Amino acid sequence: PDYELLTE
Amino acid sequence: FLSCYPWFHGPISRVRAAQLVQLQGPDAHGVFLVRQSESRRGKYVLTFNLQGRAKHLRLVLTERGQCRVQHLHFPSVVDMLRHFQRSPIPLECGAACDVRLSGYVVVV
Ligand SMILES: [Cl-]
């Protein structure tokens, strides 16, 4: 499925 | 290890976790739980309510108990949670998706 990405 | 915390639900499914944090609608913005990953064993997930929708953030727990979320390192899962109670989770959608962790779903 899909997991969140953080701004880096 | 994590079974002493009330917000840890162990091996619950992604769908069950989503429904738990979505049950109270957008009023529960920021409500969260932590679970074992369902699609990558050994890993963990922070599942949280964002404007009524469930979101899922992968967590890595080292053998020493420390917690990594992508580029961010914390001494413990508890420290990660307290950090995101005080500062917004830096998601890609920026200010339109502002969220700080608030309450948690208590495990049954
Ligand atoms: Cl650290």
B14, B56, B69: residue with CB nearest A6? B69
Q: How far apart are CA B44 and CA B47, in angstroms?
A: 10
Nearest to B32 by CA among B94, B92, B93, B77: B77
Is B92 close to A5, i.e. CB distance below 8 A?
yes
CB contact under 8 A, B91 and A1: no
Chain B: residue nearest A6 by CA? B91
- Residue B42 CA to ligand 1 center (angstroms) comes to 20
Range of the domain at B61: 1-108
DSSP chain B: -GGGSTTB--S--HHHHHHHHHTTGGGGTT-EEEEE-SSSTT-EEEEEEETTEEEEEEEEE-TTS-EEETTEEESSHHHHHHHHHHS---BTTGGGG------BPPP-
For residues B8 and B5, what is the distance between their CA atoms, to the nearest angstrom? 6
Q: How many domains does chain B have?
A: 1
Say how many CA atoms lie within 13 Å of B60 toward its Cβ.
7
Instruction: Report the amino acid identity of residue B53.
Output: R
